[PDB]
Design a protein around this nucleic acid. Structure first.
Ligand SMILES: Nc1nc2c(ncn2[C@@H]2O[C@H](COP(=O)(O)OP(=O)(O)OP(=O)(O)O)[C@@H](O)[C@H]2O)c(=O)[nH]1
Ligand SMILES: [Mg+2]
Lengths: 111, 85, 74, 77, 111, 852
RNA sequence: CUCUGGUUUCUCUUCAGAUCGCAUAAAUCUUUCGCCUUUUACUAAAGAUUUCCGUGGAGAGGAACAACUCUGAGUCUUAACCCAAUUUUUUGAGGCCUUGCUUUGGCAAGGCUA
C-alpha cells in the first residue's frame, strides 16, 4: 500500500475544518437557520476600524448573548399542521407556480 | 462438531490415569493435548465404588484444583452432573 | 515456537541432575539447545552405591532429563 | 496456545504442587512456567516415593516429565 | 423530502475550498479566551464589560463601593497596589477576585 | 461486602485474592505535564476493564477529574486513585494501584502526596511538545524520592495528523525526547543504573485519544500472532536504534544498506502506523475496506458509517486491543513492592531501616504489626466527613478494629499528639465507585473511615497495646513553597463558625494549604498560585461552608535579611539581670543557603563530616566549622547559629547547659523576624559572648528565651536589613511570532527574559523568564488576552531576591493608592505588611535593645 | 445451504426539559427601573405563562417498487499431501532371582542380564 495518496492532505485538512466541513453526513437545515456572519461578529473586531462599526460589533454580541442566556427548551406540542389542514379542506387546491408570479399574486391579494 | 469434549464441560468427570489412578473432579477445560483442568478434584486408588457394602472409599485424597497433562490420561466417563455454584 | 528453555539464569552454575533410570549426576552448566539437550562440565556420576566418579565434560540429551536442581544461588 | 496453559502462567508467583512421572512430589513457589510445561520453582519441599522429605532452594523440571500440577483455588473464579 | 445527506471526502474538500472566503481558518478555541458566551455570562452577572464585549443592565442592584463604611478588612492603608486589577482578571478567576459571585460561570482553561 | 459494582472483565473476588499476594501488586503514579494524556489513558484502561463504562464519541470521558470544578475548567485539580486488575502480554493478571495526578504546576502537592505512597512513576510526555517545565520538575522529584521511573510518549498521532512529519523525522523527534529524558535523569541522579531506552522496555509509545499503546515487545507480538515463527522478544531487541534491515539476507545490521534504507523502527513500527492512519483519514471510502481486510480487521456497516475521528478510534482499538505494553513496562521495571519496601522505609520512616520496626516493615508481611501511613484525605460529596487514604506497610487493617493515630508532631518522648480511634469501614477506591471490604493486608492502598478527627495533613496508624517503640513517617516534603497570601472574612459576622469549619475542611483537603490567624484577627490562606487559590475559594464557598465570604486582594509573603555585618556587637540581659548574651550578625556566603535548604548538609551529621564540609567547600576555619549550633527556624533553615565563644571566657559546660534555651530563642527569633514578623533568610548569627548564671532556676526557661530573641532582633536590626521578594520562574510556549509580544508584556511587570529558543520538531518557541511574584498577578491572563490566546504560560516559585529599595527608611513618603517607583518598594512593602500584621507603625533599630 | 427485517412518499394519533432548534420572534402578568402628564406606543433587567415560525421518537392507515447487500437467525462443525527420541494414534522402561516387611495375598531394596 502506498504511504500517501492524492486525497490524504485534503482529508487531514478536513479533520480540522470548521463545522459542518468536518462532517461527512447529517441532516438538512433552513436557509433562515443558517447564519453566515455569526462567526464573523463572534470574533474580535479588526484593528483600525471606525467607532460606528466597533459599536455594531458590540451590540451584535450583546443580542447574541441575550438570546443564548434567555433560551428555554421548547414545549411538548401535538404536531398540528396548518397547511395540511387547509389541503384537507375543500376550499384550497395545489399547483406549481413561478415564485415571481406568486409574489405578484400575493401583492394584489394583500392590496 | 468438536462437541464431544465441550459437552461434558462443567460436569463432574471420572478420569483414568496411565498408572491406574482415578481422578474425579469438575471438568472445566481441555486442549489439543487433552491437558485437563479439574476443579474440586479428589484422587482414588483402590476402587471406583459401585456401592461396595464394606465401604466405598479407601485411599481417597483431596487435591483441589488440578491440571493434568494429557500424555498421562487414558479415559473419561461422566461421574455426576455439574455443581450449580 | 521452537522455544528456548529459560536456562540462562543457570549458566555456569553447579547443578544436580536427576535422569531416568534412577540415575543422578552433578556438574556445571555450559550450554543448551531448544530440545533441552545440555552441556555439563566437570561432571560426576553419583553411583547408586554412594560412590562418585569423575567423567569430565559431557552431553545430556533433554529427552532423558527428569529434573535439575541448582547447588548454587541464582 | 492452550486454555490450561494460560491458567498455568496465571499461577506464576503462587505456591503450587508438582508430581513427576516418577512420583516425587515437589511443593513450593512457581517462578516461571514455559509453554511446554517446563517449571522453575523455589524453596521446595520434596516428598519421595518412600515418604521421606527434603528441602531445596531452587529447582527446574521438564514439562514432559511432569504427570500433573496442583494450583491454588485462588484461580478457580 | 430532502432531509438527510451523506457526501464523499473529495466533495467535502472542494466545498470547503469554495467556502474558504466565509471561514476564518481557525483550528482552536484558544482565540476565544475570555470572549465566549460563558465569559460574557460571567461579565453580565457581575455587571462588568469586557473591553470589546457587550454591556447590559445590572442583573442585581449593584453594590455601590461608596456604600461600605471602611471596615478593618477593606482599609486602603493596608493594600499594596502594583497593577490595577482589571475586569478581565475578575472574569478569569471569578472566585478569587469577587465578593458575592452569584450566577457566575467558570471558563474553560487552556487547550 | 456484596455492594453493587459495575460489570467488569475481572471479578472482585479475584481482586481480593490478588490483594493478599504482595508479589503481584504494583503501586504506580501517573504524572507528567498539563494536558499530556494521563486522564484519558486512565479512562481507556477503565474502559478496557469495564466493558459498560464507555467514552463518548465526540466528548472524552475521564472517569477521573470527577469534581464539578474539574469538569468545568477542564484541568485536573485533585489526584484520583484507581485499583484495577490488568492482564500482561503473556496473559498473566496483576493488581495495579494507579494514582493519577494533576498536571498543572500549581497542584504539585498532589503529586508529592501520591509519590509518598507510590513505588513507581510513569511519566507521560507529549510527542509534539516534548519535555516541559513540569516534566523536568517531576523527574527531579521522583529521582530524589527514590522511585523507579518509566516513560510513556503520548499523543504520537500529532506527528501524523498535525505536523504530518515523515516517518524518519518522527523517529528523530522520538529519539530526541528520549535523549532529553536520559540527560535530565543523569543530571539529577548520580547513579547511572537508571537509563531509559525502548530497547530495555523503559519507554512506551501511546496515543490515548485513538486507543493505541505498545512497546517494541507488543508490536513484535502482533507480528508473531500474524506469522507464528518469530520470537517477539528478539524482534523487539532488534527493532529500535539504528538497526537497518537487510531483506535479501533477512538479517539486521548496524550498517545501513543502500544508503537509503530506513531504520528497522521506521520500516516495521512507524510506517505501517502512518499507513493505517492515512488510509482511515483520507481514503475512508475508496480503499479502506481493502486495507482493513489485509489487516484482518472486520467492522460492521453501522460502525464504518461513523465520522473520521470515531472511525479512527474504533479501527485502532480493533487492531491493537489492550494496553499490554504499559503492563509489561510496569511489571518489569517497578518493584514488587516486596522488593521496593526497604528503600521506602529507608527514605520515609523516621526511625530508620536499622530499627527493629524498620526490619519488621521492610519484610512487608500481612501478619505483623500495623503501620498504615495516611497521606490523603478525601471528602464525601456532602462535605461533612473525610476518609483517610493511605498505604499499609505492615499488618492488616480490619473494619471495626480499634487503632492508634499519631499526628505529625508526635515523638516517642512527647506522647500527646496521639489518640485512640475506631475504624468503621474500609474501601478499595476505584475512581467513581468504592468497593467496600472487610480487611486490607500490607502492601495496598485503602480508604479508612473514622480516623479523620485527630489528623490534619499526614498521619500514621498503628495498633494500641503494642509497637510502643513506634515513630511517625516523615511529613511530606513539598516540591515548592506556598507564597501567595490572601485574607478571608465572612459577609455576615454572625456566620463565623461556618467559615471556620470550612477553613478547617479546606486545610485537610489541600495538602499544602496553610491557614492561620494573624495578630489583628485576620484569617490568612497561603497558596502556590492564582488558579490554586481560586479553586480553594470555590470549594470553601460552595462545598464545605455555604456562606458568603469576602476575599482581600492577593499579596505575597516577604523575607528579611542583612547585607553587611552588624555595626556594633549587640547584647542583652535577663529580667533577672544575669545571663547576658552578646551576638553579631553577618550575611552568609553565596549558595550556603541553597545547600542547607536542599539538605546538602544536615545538622544530624556527625560534627566531623559537618566541619569537613564547612572547611573544604565554603573556606571556613575548622574552629568555627565545629562551633555550629542551629540552622534557622527548622533543622534545615537558611540562617546559621555559630558560637564564636572562646573557651577562655566562658565555661563550655556552663554554656552547654543553656545551649538548648539559646537555640530555642534563636529559632523563634529567626522564625518571626523584627522587620515585619516574617522569616529571616541568609544570615549568620555568631554568639560572641555568653555570661551564664550559676543556678538552673536562675537560668533557662522564661529567662534566656526572651533575651535570646531580643538579642537576635537587635543584632539583625543593627546589621543593614533588607527585604527579600519571592521570584517566579515563568515558561511561555508561544508561536514563532508572538515572542516580541511576550517580551513587551514581561517588561511591563519588572520581568527579565532569561532565554528564548525554538522547540525542535515543532513550529513553536519556549521563552523562559523571571518575574516578581507580587507583579505576577494577572500576568498569564494579560499575556493570553494580549496575544489572542496563542501564548500560554506557567509560573512557579524559584528563589528569593532583595527588593530594590531600602526598607528601614523614614524619609520616604507613601500615598495610600499609588503604584510606587522601585527605589522605595522596600519601604512600602514593609509598612503596609506591618499594618496588615497589626504591629506598630514603624520599627526602630533600638526597639529591642536593653538600653532604651 | 434457507427465514425475518426493506426503501421512498402521503396522511392521522400520541409523548418529548433532548443545543427537541449547532437558530431565534411576538403577546400577557408580576418585581425592579427610565421616568411619569393620560392612551397607544414604549425604555431595560429579572421571573412566570401563552401563541406563532420549526423538529425528533413511537404507533396507525394509505401507495410506489426491491425483494436477500446488510442486520441477524436457522446453520460454531471439512477433505487434497506429508510426520513425530520431553509432555498421548508406532515408542527399545523388557524380564528374573535373593533379602527384608506384611496374617497370606501383597510392598521396598540390591544384583543378573543379551
Ligand atoms: N491529539 C491527541 N490529543 C489527546 C490525546 N489524548 C488526550 N488528548 C487531549 O488532551 C487533552 C488533555 O486531556 P487529559 O489527558 O484528559 O488531561 P490530563 O492528561 O489528565 O491532564 P490534566 O488536565 O492536568 O489532569 C484533552 O482535551 C484531550 O482531548 C491523544 O492521544 N492525541
Ligand atoms: Mg488528569
Amino acid at each position: 500500500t502506498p504511504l500517501y495518496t492524492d486525497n490524504t492532505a485534503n482529508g487531514i485538512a478536513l479533520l480540522w475544518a470548521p463545522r459542518p466541513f468536518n462532517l461527512r453526513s447529517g441532516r438538512t437545515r433552513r436557509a433562515l437557520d443558517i447564519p453566515l456572519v455569526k462567526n464573523w461578529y463572534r470574533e474580535h473586531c479588526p484593528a483600525g476600524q471606525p467607532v460606528k462599526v466597533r459599536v455594531s460589533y458590540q451590540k451584535l454580541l450583546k443580542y447574541y448573548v441575550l438570546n443564548a442566556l434567555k433560551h428555554r427548551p421548547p414545549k411538548a406540542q401535538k404536531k398540528r399542521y396548518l397547511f395540511r389542514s387547509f389541503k384537507a379542506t375543500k376550499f384550497f387546491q395545489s399547483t406549481k407556480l413561478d415564485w415571481v408570479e406568486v409574489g405578484l399574486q400575493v401583492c394584489r391579494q394583500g392590496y | 462438531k468438536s462437541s464431544k469434549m465441550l459437552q461434558h464441560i462443567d460436569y463432574r468427570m471420572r478420569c483414568i490415569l496411565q498408572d491406574g489412578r482415578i481422578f474425579i473432579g469438575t471438568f472445566k477445560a481441555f486442549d489439543k493435548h487433552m491437558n485437563l483442568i479439574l476443579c474440586d478434584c479428589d484422587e482414588f486408588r483402590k476402587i471406583k465404588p459401585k456401592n461396595s457394602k464394606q465401604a466405598e472409599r479407601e485411599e481417597k485424597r483431596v487435591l483441589g484444583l488440578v491440571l493434568l497433562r494429557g500424555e498421562n490420561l487414558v479415559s473419561m466417563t461422566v461421574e455426576g452432573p455439574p455443581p450449580k455454584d | 515456537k521452537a522455544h528456548p528453555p529459560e536456562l540462562k539464569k543457570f549458566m555456569d552454575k553447579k547443578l544436580s541432575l536427576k535422569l531416568n533410570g534412577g540415575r543422578h549426576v552433578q556438574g556445571i552448566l555450559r550450554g543448551f539447545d531448544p530440545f533441552m539437550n545440555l552441556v555439563i562440565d566437570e561432571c560426576v556420576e553419583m553411583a547408586t552405591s554412594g560412590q562418585q566418579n569423575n567423567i569430565g565434560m559431557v552431553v545430556i540429551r533433554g529427552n532423558s532429563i527428569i529434573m535439575l536442581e541448582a547447588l548454587e544461588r541464582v | 496456545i492452550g486454555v490450561p496453559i494460560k491458567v498455568l502462567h496465571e499461577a506464576e508467583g503462587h505456591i503450587v504442587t508438582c508430581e513427576t512421572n516418577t512420583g516425587e512430589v515437589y511443593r513450593g513457589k512457581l517462578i516461571e512456567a514455559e509453554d511446554n510445561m517446563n517449571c522453575q520453582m523455589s524453596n521446595i519441599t520434596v516428598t519421595y516415593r518412600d515418604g521421606r522429605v527434603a528441602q531445596l532452594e531452587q529447582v527446574y523440571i521438564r514439562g514432559s516429565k511432569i504427570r500433573f500440577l496442583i494450583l491454588p483455588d485462588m484461580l478457580k473464579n | 423530502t430532502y432531509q438527510r445527506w451523506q457526501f464523499t471526502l473529495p466533495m467535502m474538500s472542494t466545498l470547503y475550498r469554495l467556502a474558504n472566503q466565509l471561514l476564518t481558518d481557525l483550528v482552536d478555541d484558544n482565540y476565544f479566551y475570555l470572549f465566549d458566551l460563558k465569559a460574557f455570562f460571567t461579565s453580565k452577572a457581575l455587571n462588568m464589560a469586557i473591553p470589546g464585549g457587550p454591556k447590559f443592565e445590572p442583573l442585581v442592584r449593584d453594590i455601590n463601593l461608596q456604600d461600605e463604611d471602611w471596615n478593618e478588612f477593606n482599609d486602603i492603608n493596608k493594600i499594596i497596589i502594583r497593577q490595577p486589577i482589571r475586569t478581565e482578571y475578575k472574569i478569569a478567576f471569578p472566585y478569587l477576585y469577587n465578593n458575592l459571585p452569584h450566577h457566575v460561570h467558570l471558563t474553560w482553561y487552556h487547550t | 461486602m456484596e455492594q453493587t459494582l459495575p460489570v467488569t472483565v475481572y471479578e472482585m473476588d479475584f481482586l481480593a485474592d490478588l490483594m493478599d499476594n504482595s508479589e503481584l501488586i504494583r503501586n504506580v503514579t501517573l504524572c507528567g505535564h498539563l494536558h499530556h494524556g494521563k486522564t484519558c489513558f486512565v479512562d481507556c484502561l477503565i474502559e478496557q476493564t469495564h466493558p459498560e463504562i464507555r467514552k463518548r464519541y465526540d466528548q472524552d470521558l475521564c472517569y477521573t477529574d470527577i469534581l464539578f470544578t474539574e469538569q468545568e475548567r477542564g484541568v485536573g485539580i485533585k489526584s484520583t486513585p484507581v485499583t484495577v486488575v490488568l492482564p500482561d502480554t503473556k496473559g498473566k493478571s496483576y493488581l495495579f494501584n494507579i494514582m493519577d495526578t494533576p498536571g498543572h504546576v500549581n497542584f504539585s502537592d498532589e503529586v508529592t502526596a501520591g509519590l509518598r505512597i507510590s513505588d513507581g512513576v510513569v511519566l507521560f510526555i507529549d510527542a509534539a511538545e516534548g519535555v516541559m517545565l513540569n516534566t523536568e520538575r517531576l523527574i527531579k522529584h521522583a529521582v530524589q524520592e527514590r522511585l523507579a521511573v518509566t516513560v510513556c510518549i503520548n499523543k504520537i498521532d500529532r506527528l501524523i495528523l498535525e505536523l504530518k512529519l515523515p516517518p524518519t523525522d518522527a523517529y528523530y523527534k522520538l529519539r530526541h525526547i528520549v535523549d532529553e529524558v536520559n540527560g535530565l535523569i543523569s543530571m539529577y541522579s548520580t547513579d547511572e543504573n537508571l537509563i531509559l531506552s525502548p530497547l530495555l522496555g523503559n519507554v512506551c509509545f501511546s496515543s490515548s485519544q485513538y486507543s493505541i499503546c505498545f512497546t517494541l515487545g507488543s508490536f513484535a507480538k502482533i507480528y508473531a500472532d500474524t506469522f507464528g515463527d518469530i520470537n517477539y522478544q528478539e524482534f523487539a531487541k532488534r527493532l529500535w536504534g539504528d538497526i537497518y534491515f537487510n531483506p535479501k539476507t533477512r538479517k539486521f545490521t548496524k550498517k545501513a544498506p543502500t544508503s537509503s534504507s530506513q531504520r528497522s523502527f521506521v520500516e516495521f513500527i512507524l510506517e505501517p502506523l502512518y499507513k493505517i492512519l492515512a488510509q482511515v483519514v483520507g481514503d475512508v471510502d475508496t480503499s479502506l475496506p481493502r486495507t482493513l481486510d489485509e489487516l484482518g480487521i472486520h467492522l460492521t456497516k453501522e460502525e464504518l458509517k461513523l465520522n473520521i475521528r470515531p472511525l479512527l478510534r474504533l479501527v485502532c482499538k480493533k487492531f491493537f486491543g489492550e494496553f499490554t505494553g504499559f503492563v509489561d513496562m510496569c511489571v518489569q521495571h517497578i518493584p514488587s513492592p516486596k522488593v521496593g519496601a526497604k528503600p521506602k522505609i529507608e527514605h520515609t520512616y523516621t526511625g530508620g531501616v536499622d530499627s527493629d520496626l524498620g526490619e519488621a516493615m521492610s519484610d512487608c508481611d500481612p501478619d505483623g504489626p500495623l503501620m498504615c501511613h495516611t497521606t490523603k484525605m478525601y471528602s464525601t460529596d456532602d462535605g461533612v466527613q473525610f476518609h483517610a487514604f493511605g498505604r499499609v506497610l505492615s499488618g492488616t487493617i480490619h473494619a471495626g478494629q480499634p487503632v492508634k493515630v499519631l499526628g505529625e508532631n508526635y515523638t516517642l518522648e512527647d506522647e500527646e499528639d496521639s489518640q485512640i480511634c475506631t475504624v468503621g469501614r474500609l474501601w478499595i477506591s476505584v475512581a467513581r465507585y468504592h468497593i467496600e471490604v472487610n480487611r486490607v493486608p500490607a502492601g495496598n492502598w485503602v480508604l479508612i473511615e473514622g480516623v479523620d478527627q485527630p489528623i490534619v495533613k499526614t498521619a500514621t496508624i498503628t495498633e494500641p497495646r503494642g509497637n510502643e517503640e513506634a515513630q511517625i513517617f516523615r511529613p511530606l516534603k513539598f516540591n515548592t513553597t506556598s507564597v501567595i497570601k490572601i485574607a478571608v472574612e465572612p459577609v455576615n459576622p454572625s456566620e463565623l463558625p461556618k467559615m471556620l469549619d470550612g477553613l478547617r475542611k479546606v486545610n485537610k483537603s489541600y495538602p499544602s494549604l496553610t491557614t492561620k490567624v494573624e495578630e489583628s484577627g485576620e484569617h490568612v490562606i497561603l497558596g502556590t498560585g492564582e488558579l490554586y487559590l481560586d479553586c480553594v475559594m470555590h470549594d470553601l464557598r460552595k462545598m464545605y461552608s455555604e456562606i458568603d465570604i469576602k476575599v482581600a486582594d492577593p499579596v505575597v509573603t516577604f523575607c528579611e535579611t542583612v547585607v553587611e555585618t552588624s555595626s556594633l556587637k549587640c547584647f542583652a540581659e535577663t529580667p533577672n539581670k544575669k545571663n547576658k548574651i552578646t551576638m553579631i550578625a553577618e550575611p552568609l556566603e553565596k549558595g550556603l543557603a541553597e545547600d542547607i535548604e536542599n539538605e546538602v548538609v544536615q545538622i544530624t551529621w556527625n560534627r566531623k563530616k559537618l566541619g569537613e564540609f564547612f572547611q573544604t567547600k565554603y573556606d571556613w576555619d575548622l574552629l568555627a566549622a565545629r562551633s555550629i549550633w542551629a540552622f534557622g527556624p527548622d533543622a534545615t533553615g537558611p540562617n546559621i547559629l555559630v558560637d564564636d565563644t572562646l573557651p577562655s571566657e566562658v565555661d563550655k559546660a556552663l554554656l552547654g547547659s543553656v545551649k538548648d534555651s539559646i537555640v530555642q530563642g534563636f529559632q523563634w527569633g529567626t522564625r518571626e523576624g523584627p522587620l515585619c514578623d516574617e522569616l529571616i533568610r541568609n544570615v549568620k548569627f555568631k554568639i560572641l559572648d555568653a555570661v551564664v548564671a550559676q543556678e538552673p532556676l536562675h537560668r533557662g526557661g522564661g529567662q534566656i528565651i526572651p533575651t535570646a530573641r531580643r538579642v537576635v532582633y537587635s543584632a539583625f536590626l543593627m546589621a543593614t536589613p533588607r527585604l527579600m521578594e519571592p521570584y517566579y520562574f515563568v515558561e511561555v510556549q508561544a508561536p514563532a511570532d508572538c515572542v516580541s509580544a511576550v517580551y513587551t508584556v514581561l517588561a511591563r511587570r519588572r520581568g527579565h527574559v532569561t532565554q528564548d529558543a525554538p522547540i525542535p520538531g515543532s513550529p513553536l518557541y519556549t521563552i523562559k523568564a523571571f518575574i516578581p511574584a507580587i507583579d505576577s498577578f494577572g500576568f498569564e491572563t494579560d499575556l493570553r488576552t494580549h496575544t489572542q490566546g496563542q501564548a500560554f504560560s506557567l509560573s512557579v516559585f524559584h528563589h528569593w531576591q532583595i527588593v530594590p529599595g531600602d526598607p528601614l527608611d523614614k524619609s520616604i513618603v507613601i500615598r495610600p493608592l499609588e503604584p510606587q517607583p522601585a527605589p522605595h518598594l522596600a519601604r512600602e512593602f514593609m509598612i503596609k505588611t506591618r499594618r496588615r500584621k497589626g504591629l506598630s507603625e514603624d520599627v526602630s533599630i533600638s526597639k529591642f535593645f536593653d538600653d532604651p
